[PDB]
């Protein structure tokens, strides 16, 4: 008990192991059933604790590694009269273990914390209340993106419709696909070198337009 | 009337029960996730115990625990003792605790913003 699973959860998992023990038992050996059952029972319980405990599920072998690191660090802390360094544990672990790998292992074993974690001695505040959303775009982001699309269309209108369409198909403004020179040449009806020529002229015109107007510069981020 | 009994328990969308990585690179998640994990674990174990076949005593206790898990999800602390995280005395926040209460969805986020 106390290893992350409730009492009844442990019992039922031991019941699974008990079932396994019954079906795998051989009475000819004159062994009392309790002897052979206990092994399968402990095995099922330990497997359950290793699997169900952590919110971020970690493979059993990796858990045995982490727990081995726990007994190691605790042995060292018990003999040194202080908490061990990464390098000290790396030594006592044996070959293949350096300070870097130890720190990585510890980083993996880090469990998540509840968002409902109490903030303050009152019940009016929670932990997740102080965490911003990094995913959804702020109004500034959406407005800037719209301004960029508008200013880019204002820039592509300083070109012809053909030499701007070559670029819109090239970088994927229209349809959302970047095309090779062969496809754009298969559409407009000219050679791929003509398309690459048109795209060079268009980009160069946009460079001269940029050098004069000073509009798209602020969007460089 | 038989809709008052659940054959299929719904699952709230992940973003409304989020698992996010904070500033320090650490992880923080909602209690509903631990509650759902309780449900799935006890449910899957029941399906296995039924499949391989088990005495009615074991199946009974597993079923009773399943109801306990369902109750814990919908309304924690309602029936008997509240479900908590290990080492903690703090009861997990259930769907009832989220909707109702002075800190509930209604009073805190709907009637005021």
């Amino acid at each position: 008990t106390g290893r992350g699973l409730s009492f009844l959860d442990l019992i039922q998992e031991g019941n699974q192991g008990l079932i396994r023990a019954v079906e795998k038992f051989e009475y000819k050996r004159r062994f009392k059933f309790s002897t052979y059952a206990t092994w399968w029972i402990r095995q099922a319980i330990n497997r359950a604790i290793a699997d169900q405990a952590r919110t971020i599920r970690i493979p059993v072998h990796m858990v045995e590694t982490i727990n081995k690191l726990s007994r190691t660090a605790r042995q060292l802390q018990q003999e040194l009269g202080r908490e061990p360094t990464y390098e000290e544990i790396a030594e006592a672990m044996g070959p293949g273990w350096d300070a870097k790998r130890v720190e990585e292992t510890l980083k993996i074993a880090q469990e998540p914390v509840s968002l409902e974690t109490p903030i303050g001695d009152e019940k009016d505040s929670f932990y997740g209340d102080f965490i911003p959303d990094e995913h959804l775009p702020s109004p500034v982001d959406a407005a800037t993106q719209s301004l960029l699309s508008e200013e880019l269309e204002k820039a592509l209108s300083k070109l012809s419709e053909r030499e701007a369409m070559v670029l819109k198909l090239r970088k994927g403004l229209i349809d959302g696909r970047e095309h090779t020179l062969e496809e754009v040449g298969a559409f407009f009806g000219v050679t791929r070198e003509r398309i690459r020529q048109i795209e060079n002229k268009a980009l160069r015109k946009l460079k001269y337009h940029e050098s004069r107007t000073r509009k798209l510069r602020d969007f460089l981020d | 009337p038989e809709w008052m009994i659940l054959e299929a328990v719904p699952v709230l969308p992940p973003d409304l029960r989020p698992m996010v990585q904070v500033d320090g690179g650490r992880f923080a998640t909602s209690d509903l996730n631990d509650l759902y994990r309780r449900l799935i674990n006890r449910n899957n174990r029941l399906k296995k115990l039924l499949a391989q076949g088990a005495p009615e005593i074991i199946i009974r206790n597993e079923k009773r625990m399943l109801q306990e898990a369902v109750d814990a999800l919908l309304d924690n602390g309602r029936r008997g003792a509240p479900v908590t995280n290990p080492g903690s005395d703090r009861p997990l926040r259930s769907l009832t605790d989220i909707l109702s209460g002075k800190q509930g969805r209604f009073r805190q986020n709907l009637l005021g913003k």
């Binding site: 009844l8 | 005593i57 206790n61 009773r64 306990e68 008997g80």
Partner: peptide, 14 residues
Amino acid sequence: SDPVRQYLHEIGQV
């Protein structure tokens, strides 16, 4: 009432 005690009673019958 108490799930643990109840299961312990169901076990004491056998």
